Design a protein that fits this description.
Helices cover 39% and strands 25% of the residues. With 181 residues, the chain is of the alpha+beta class. It has a six-stranded antiparallel sheet with strand order 1-2-3-4-5-6. The PDB classes it as oxidoreductase.
């Protein structure tokens, strides 16, 4: 089901955004560590990042975050699931925002959660468009960074996933919630 939610997630991103190679991320697509990191963007979403660790030899985690463009004041789609096998230990999801309309709009528990996240994504990519230009660039940068500061400081789960300590500090600081100029 986690793999299904992943393919459904990738299909949505391919149908609305365009994939690009973010500088530095090539250091974190390692087939031996089951590490895949992929980023998309479009006019309305500056960054959409899919981080998947497939290490069932035994855990399995995924991270998905979407930042809107810099004149938009919309929330941040965020979905984080760590389960591995036989059990879902951690699950997180919301449209982290101030007040905003898109926020106000909002093996069974794994079935519904994944269906929601997949359907909440398709709906996020649609409604976020309606908020282009409603904010000033400086304040949007400040808001998104403040979210990146508080969420950059993960290391334990990545240590749990068996990722090198050096790559962890490299990934968490430069290619997870990057700051914008």
């Amino acid at each position: 089901r986690l793999i299904k939610w992943k393919d459904e997630t990738i299909e949505v991103l391919n149908n609305n955004l365009v994939e690009y190679n973010e500088p530095g991320m090539e250091r974190f697509n390692n087939e031996k560590l089951g590490w895949v990191n992929r980023t998309w963007n479009n006019r309305y979403i500056r960054r959409a990042h899919l981080d998947v660790v497939d290490v069932r030899e035994g855990l399995w985690m995924a991270h998905l975050c979407l930042f809107p463009m810099l004149t938009n004041g919309g929330p941040i789609y965020g979905f984080d699931i760590i389960a591995g096998e036989k059990k879902v230990t951690g699950a997180f999801h919301d449209f982290s925002p101030k007040d905003h309309p898109l926020t106000k709009w909002f093996e069974d528990e794994l079935n519904k959660i994944c269906t929601m996240a997949v359907s909440n994504l398709n709906n996020y990519i649609d409604k976020i468009r309606n908020h282009e230009g409603e904010a000033e660039m400086a304040d949007v940068i400040k808001a998104q960074n403040y979210y990146s500061e508080h969420q950059q400081k993960t290391p334990r789960v990545m240590q749990s996933l068996g990722l090198p300590e050096e790559d962890i500090k490299l990934f968490c600081s430069d290619n997870l919630f990057p700051f914008v100029s």
